[PDB]
Amino acid sequence: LEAIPCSIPPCFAFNKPFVF
């Protein structure tokens, strides 16, 4: 969660996209 908020959509530490 702080470490990585995603794993699946293209994320890089703090994107969780909105939107892309």
Add this chain to the structure above:
Amino acid sequence: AVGIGALFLGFLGAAGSTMGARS
């Protein structure tokens, strides 16, 4: 920055970074 919230959404703008690169 804490992460999302301080960085309002963390907009992926527009290829791969905390909140967007010049890309």
